[PDB]
Design an enzyme around this catalytic site. Sequence first.
Site, PDB file in Angstrom:
ATOM      1  N   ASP A  90       0.863  -1.210   0.000  1.00  0.00           N
ATOM      2  CA  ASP A  90       0.000   0.000   0.000  1.00  0.00           C
ATOM      3  C   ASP A  90       0.895   1.253   0.000  1.00  0.00           C
ATOM      4  O   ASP A  90       0.854   2.014   0.941  1.00  0.00           O
ATOM      5  CB  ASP A  90      -0.943  -0.108   1.200  1.00  0.00           C
ATOM      6  CG  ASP A  90      -1.988   0.988   1.338  1.00  0.00           C
ATOM      7  OD1 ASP A  90      -2.202   1.723   0.406  1.00  0.00           O
ATOM      8  OD2 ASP A  90      -2.576   1.049   2.414  1.00  0.00           O
ATOM      9  N   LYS A  92       0.807   3.783  -2.248  1.00  0.00           N
ATOM     10  CA  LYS A  92       0.108   4.993  -2.698  1.00  0.00           C
ATOM     11  C   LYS A  92       1.028   5.863  -3.526  1.00  0.00           C
ATOM     12  O   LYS A  92       1.193   7.047  -3.280  1.00  0.00           O
ATOM     13  CB  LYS A  92      -0.480   5.756  -1.495  1.00  0.00           C
ATOM     14  CG  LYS A  92      -1.413   4.925  -0.627  1.00  0.00           C
ATOM     15  CD  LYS A  92      -2.081   5.829   0.413  1.00  0.00           C
ATOM     16  CE  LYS A  92      -3.017   5.184   1.418  1.00  0.00           C
ATOM     17  NZ  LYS A  92      -3.799   4.103   0.894  1.00  0.00           N
ATOM     18  N   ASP A  95       3.329  10.074  -8.103  1.00  0.00           N
ATOM     19  CA  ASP A  95       4.339  10.806  -8.911  1.00  0.00           C
ATOM     20  C   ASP A  95       4.403  10.161 -10.302  1.00  0.00           C
ATOM     21  O   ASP A  95       3.726   9.144 -10.527  1.00  0.00           O
ATOM     22  CB  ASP A  95       5.696  10.797  -8.212  1.00  0.00           C
ATOM     23  CG  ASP A  95       6.565  12.003  -8.533  1.00  0.00           C
ATOM     24  OD1 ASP A  95       6.208  12.745  -9.466  1.00  0.00           O
ATOM     25  OD2 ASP A  95       7.577  12.165  -7.851  1.00  0.00           O
TER      26      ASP A  95
END
Lengths: 257, 257
Positions: A90, A92, A95
């Site tokens: 996880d 996330k 970019d």
Amino acid sequence: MELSFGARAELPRIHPVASKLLRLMQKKETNLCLSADVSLARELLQLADALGPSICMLKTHVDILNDFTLDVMKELITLAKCHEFLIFEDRKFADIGNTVKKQYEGGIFKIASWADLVNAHVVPGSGVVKGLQEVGLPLHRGCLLIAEMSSTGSLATGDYTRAAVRMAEEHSEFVVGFISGSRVSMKPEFLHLTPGVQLEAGGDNLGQQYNSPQEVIGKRGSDIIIVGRGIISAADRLEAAEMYRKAAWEAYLSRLG
Amino acid sequence: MELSFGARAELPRIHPVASKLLRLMQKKETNLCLSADVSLARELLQLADALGPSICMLKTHVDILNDFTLDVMKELITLAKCHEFLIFEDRKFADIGNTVKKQYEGGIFKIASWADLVNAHVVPGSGVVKGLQEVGLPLHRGCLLIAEMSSTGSLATGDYTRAAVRMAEEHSEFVVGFISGSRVSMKPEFLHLTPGVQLEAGGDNLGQQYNSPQEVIGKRGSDIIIVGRGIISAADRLEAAEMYRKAAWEAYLSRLG
């Protein structure tokens, strides 16, 4: 005309990682993802071994593991293969370009070497998926897009959620589903995973809306519940995992009829 | 009635980290942040030492450093103190609660132990700031909120950008500014840092809109340019840094009059 997990595993447009997941969900009668929110490798591996049979997926944050090594992740893969669950980091990602590719492939963690699934925020635009997929596609991995969040004041609503679904649709070679509070895509090839799940009505100090397995699987049409505190903070984590597994699995069966 | 960096450093409501930054920007005549997008500790430390005098800030991605150790970050702090620049870890935190606090304080990287600044996405709601600030405030750190992005198809626009500014305003004890393409707050106590900067008109394959120092500092009212490829991919990185520093500094002087 809702299909079983086992039938969704065979859909023409299914991603191989999604197919593997859906098959083991059907085989083991589990749509539970354990959020293994622990700081020490020993506790992570003891939970993965004991709860492995009860879960379809183990969600990691390796950046909180005080004693991370790649050898810990080798031991976790052994357990994932033995008990049949996927590893979901996880991270996330949020970019684009060469930087996101290196964050996924490289550094100390080498996430793509051991994570079946990762997730990404859609706020940067489709560059996040394009960067990850440059690494992930050759390594036969998948990605989940964060379409909605359980947190108080989430901005992942309305047109933002619709943008996440469009991005997934358009990158189905790599994107296998969503983190969401409900079904957001009508396409059965996508998985829906929902955090903010507990059996009791309740909340936390840092701001999260919680819902029951029956609500999110049965009423809101999600596929998989992600559960952390409801299991991890219990004395008997095995019995807690079994209570969540049975809740989520029955909610699924009842929506199938 | 625009104030100099040195006068903004003395504003009643200024955050101490913002004040330190604004003072060294004025002293060194630099509003350049180097994006040190390298995979090896030796190159990171050689760039920090050589370019230290030219920069107000060094932006890191320690999760791409193949040979990260805390001793590398000790050596980087020595250079930051010697040459007078801040360390900004571009981690783009984008979660809440105990997990975001541990991602900031703990794991292998112990980011809060060495980073003066970190940044956060606002999509989860103010829980991201509340979680970080539980760690960051006692460690006297600051945070930047990502209000706008340079990437093609960015969703950080309109009401999302306004939500980021409100969140910063309301958490000024910890939030010291923004990642943005332009001035987004009228309050002079906030810093504006802008990526997607190069001297030439141009773009990249993974999707970014580039603008010149004169455009983003002079016309769009930002404070600091963040420059990666324009410096890092040049043969003479010192001369490249000096070209960017002079461009950004003159654009700043010209907007002051």
